């Protein structure tokens, strides 16, 4: 399932997809739920394939990815796009010395979610 993390877009909404977009599987369903409730244009997808290294490089955590390998390549990728990391991931929190967001800490980290909704 982690290897199915990202997919290939055929056709957009009013957002910036188009042929051969390389977006996350979850973001796809995002767009779906949102826009198909209003109508407009829902995007078509097909899931694509990431094996190990690929999948790792795909993830929405550059800290996690940089912790893996190809640190050089990785980091400039990140730097260029101005990528933002919200600390969903585990090794993320590891490296920040924070509350791992599984079990024991999962509770605390989900609490921060509603803290983002209100102040």
């Amino acid at each position: 399932r982690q290897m199915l993390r990202k997919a290939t877009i055929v056709n957009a909404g009013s957002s910036d997809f188009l042929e051969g977009e390389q977006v996350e599987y979850s973001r796809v369903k995002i767009a779906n739920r949102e826009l198909e409730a209003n109508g407009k244009v829902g995007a078509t997808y097909s899931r694509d394939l990431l094996g190990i290294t690929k999948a790792s490089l795909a993830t929405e955590s550059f800290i996690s990815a940089a912790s893996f390998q190809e640190t050089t390549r990785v980091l400039t990728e990140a730097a260029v796009a101005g990528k933002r990391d919200e600390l969903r991931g585990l090794k993320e929190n590891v490296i920040v010395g924070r509350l791992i967001p599984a079990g024991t800490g999962y509770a605390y980290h989900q609490d921060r979610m509603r803290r983002r909704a209100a102040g």
């Binding site: 640190t71 101005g82 983002r116």
Partner: protein, 489 residues
């Protein structure tokens, strides 16, 4: 503290100016006799903070009574030394230099943005050949290679309007003047006509980059660096070994060579030197900066006095023994011990033999606290010396702490989660740890010279999670197979 997210982006020169608190002009480090920092030097206290807490260079202003006051003579503000762990400085390079990373490492986004292949750009920077920047005269367009005398025939007849140059400066110029906004639009209109599949693929990826570029709000000009941010001193430390020798980080050396060349550049500027030498100086400048960030990733690797290439910034981060693997996704641990394991047939399933002396050391702070509470120790200093004498009271207090406490037993390699387990420790004299036989399979351990580490779950939550989840007794069914883990051997 309380923050939520991190954004990683390009370094604006004025952003470096923002963090950077002073300019490092001198290659000097510290004075040869008075080992205190040199004025505008690499370890300068005027910039990065005072050597010793709330005490400046020349020593007129002492004590906590001064906090943020600025030493009139020596220019040292009075506060914690610890600021040398965070204050960043800056180097003003007269020749803006290329950022290595965006050149030499793939894909090399500069190249991508300007659709320029590598060697052509190279020759431009290295000052092998000139490049076309912007001409009212359609004589030439953008981004053409011209050698020496190819440049000569053109100006001689033209000039005036005709604008092209050489090197990094030229690149940065081309970058500021290029209309990213318009190009995005034009590329959509190119898609508006022939959308041939292969062409459309690469056209797709290029527009992706440009659009993300002004979404982040980043200026390409930043690609080339004018101001270089310079690392805090404590991170590039210089101290003496006991034998009288000094050791210092290699970054200091790279930085040194950098300002040498940069400052010779300033001299050669003022003296109006020939262009041959200017260029040579800039290549070297380029070189020095680039070996600073990533050594070996450019030309021939800069060598240590040894034989080995010198370890730069990137090396520190990336390496397996870099910051990630050494300091971040694992660290060195307190309240821990280790030694040889030995069978304990008498042990119950939830028990481990723990050598007196080992547990002693671990529980030190606990002992001290309980000493003072019992009043058997007037204060903590006496508590320490009370344990270090080794009297009988020490064993009983330790005995009460060990009661209901778990300790953590590590064994490498970490196969699965039971390679580290929580056990109730059973004190014995002797220096061997004793292990329950049935859990041999979980550690994949056997008795013929294996050593186990030990740690202290320190908080109430530590203790709790160890007894609840981490107990050998609590986890007998394999997360791997459904079957029992702890089984007769």
């Amino acid at each position: 503290e309380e923050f939520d997210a991190i954004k990683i982006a390009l370094a604006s020169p004025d952003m470096i100016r923002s963090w950077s608190f002073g300019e490092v002009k001198k290659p000097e480090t510290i004075n040869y006799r008075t080992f205190k920092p040199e004025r505008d030097g690499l370890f300068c206290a005027r910039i990065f903070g005072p050597v010793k807490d709330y005490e400046c260079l020349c020593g007129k202003y002492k004590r906590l009574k001064h906090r943020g006051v600025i030493c009139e003579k020596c220019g040292v503000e009075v506060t914690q030394t610890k600021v040398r762990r965070e204050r960043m400085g800056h180097i003003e390079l007269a020749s803006p230099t290329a950022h290595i990373w965006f050149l030499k490492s793939l894909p090399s986004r500069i190249g991508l943005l300007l659709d320029m292949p590598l060697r052509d750009i190279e020759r431009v920077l290295y000052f092998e050949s000139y490049v076309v920047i912007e001409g009212g005269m359609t004589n030439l367009e953008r981004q053409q290679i011209l050698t020496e005398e190819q440049y000569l025939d053109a100006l001689e007849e033209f000039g005036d309007e005709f604008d092209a140059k050489m090197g990094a400066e030229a690149i940065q110029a081309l970058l500021k003047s290029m209309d990213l906004e318009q190009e995005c639009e034009q590329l959509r209109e190119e898609l508006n006509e022939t959308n041939s599949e292969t062409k459309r693929k690469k056209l797709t990826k290029r527009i992706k980059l440009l659009e993300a570029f002004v979404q982040s709000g980043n200026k390409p000009e930043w690609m080339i660096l004018t101001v270089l941010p310079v690392l805090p001193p404590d991170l590039r430390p210089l101290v003496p070994l006991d034998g009288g020798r000094f050791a210092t980080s290699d970054l200091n050396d790279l930085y040194r060579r950098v300002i040498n060349r940069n400052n010779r550049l300033k001299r050669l500027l003022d003296l109006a030197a020939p262009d041959i030498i200017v260029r040579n100086e800039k290549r070297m400048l380029q070189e020095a900066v680039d070996a600073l960030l990533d050594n070996g990733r450019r030309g021939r690797a800069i060598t240590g006095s040894n034989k080995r290439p010198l370890k730069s910034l990137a090396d520190m981060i990336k390496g397996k023994q870099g910051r990630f693997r050494q300091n971040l996704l694992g660290k060195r641990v307190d309240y821990s011990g280790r030694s040889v394991i030995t069978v304990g047939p008498y042990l119950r399933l939830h028990q481990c033999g723990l050598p007196k002396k080992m547990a002693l050391e671990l529980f030190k702070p606990f002992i001290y606290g309980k000493l003072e509470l019992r009043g058997l120790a007037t204060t903590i200093k006496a508590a320490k010396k009370m344990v270090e004498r080794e009297e009988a009271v020490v064993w009983d207090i330790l005995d009460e702490v060990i009661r209901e406490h778990p300790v953590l037993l590590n064994r490498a390699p970490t196969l699965h989660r039971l390679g580290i387990q929580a056990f109730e420790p059973v004190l014995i004299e002797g220096k061997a740890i004793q292990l329950h036989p049935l859990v041999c399979a979980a550690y994949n351990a056997d008795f013929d010279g294996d050593q186990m580490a030990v740690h202290v779950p320190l908080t109430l939550e530590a203790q709790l999670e160890a007894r609840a989840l981490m107990m050998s007794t609590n986890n007998i069914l394999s997360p791997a197979n459904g079957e029992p883990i702890i089984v007769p051997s």
